[PDB]
A paper describes a structure:
Matrix protein (MA), p15 in FIV or EIAV and p17 in HIV or SIV, is the N-terminal subunit of the retroviral Gag polyprotein. During the viral replication cycle, the FIV p15 matrix protein oligomerizes to form a closed matrix that underlies the lipidic envelope of the virion. In FIV, HIV or SIV, the N-terminal domain of Gag undergoes a co-translational covalent modification of the MA N-terminus with a myristoyl group. This myristoylation, together with a highly basic patch of amino acid residues located at the N-terminus of the MA, directs the Gag polyprotein to the plasma membrane (PM), mediating the association between Gag and the inner leaflet of the PM lipid bilayer, where Gag forms a hexagonal network. The structure consists of five α-helices (numbered h1 to h5 following the HIV convention), which give rise to the close packing of adjacent helices typical for retroviral matrix proteins.
FIV full-length p15 protein at 6 mg/ml in MES buffer pH 6 crystallizes in the presence of sodium acetate pH 4.6 and PEG in the space group P21212 with one molecule in the asymmetric unit. Synchrotron data were collected to 2 Å resolution. The three amino-terminal residues (Gly4-Gln5-Gly6) and the twenty carboxy-terminal residues (Met113 to Gln133) are mainly unstructured and extended. Despite its intrinsic flexibility, the C-terminal end (Met113 to Gln133) is clearly observed in the electron density map because of the stabilizing crystal contacts of the C-terminal residues 130 to 132 with the complementary monomer. An analysis of the electrostatic potential of FIV full-length p15 revealed a highly basic platform, with helix h1 having amphipathic character (residues Arg7 to Cys16). As with HIV, a hydrophobic cavity formed by the side chains of helices h1 to h4 is observed in the FIV p15 protein. The C-terminal end of FIV p15 is mainly unstructured and extended, whereas a long helix h5 is observed in HIV p17, and a short β-hairpin is reported in SIV MA. The first interface (interface 1) implicates the conserved residue Trp37, localized at the center of helix h2 and the C-terminal end of a contacting p15 monomer (Gly130 to Pro132). Of interest, the indol group of Trp37 makes extensive contacts with the Pro131 of the complementary molecule via hydrophobic stacking. Unlike SIV, HIV and EIAV MA, FIV p15 appears monomeric in the crystal, although it is dimeric in the protein solution used for crystallization.
Author numbering: 4 to 133
The structure:
Amino acid sequence: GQGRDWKMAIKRCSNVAVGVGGKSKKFGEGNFRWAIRMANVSTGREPGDIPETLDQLRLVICDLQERREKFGSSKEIDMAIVTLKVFAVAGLLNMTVSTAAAAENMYSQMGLDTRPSMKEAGGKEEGPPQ
């Protein structure tokens, strides 16, 4: 979460509004680091584990929504989930969305809330460490 791809994705997200205003503040880099870190700890991943691909990010979001379903919603888990969806849609897919609500809606319409099977995925991501 320090490379050129990370920063460009963050730059894309910086124009997205947190609230469905209007007047609303926009997302900042720290918001994404917080959301990833929160989701990582919550799902038993190493805290600094940055998703590199859309597939990896989708699985984190899936794990976190399943946690939300099992143990219940909260202002914090809800914010983490929507923040990750903004990262997927505006960051990784480079899609113009005005608000976090719009990203959430787009993420859902594209079918991304579905957790793909391992066979569906074709194969996990197995590559060199550096």
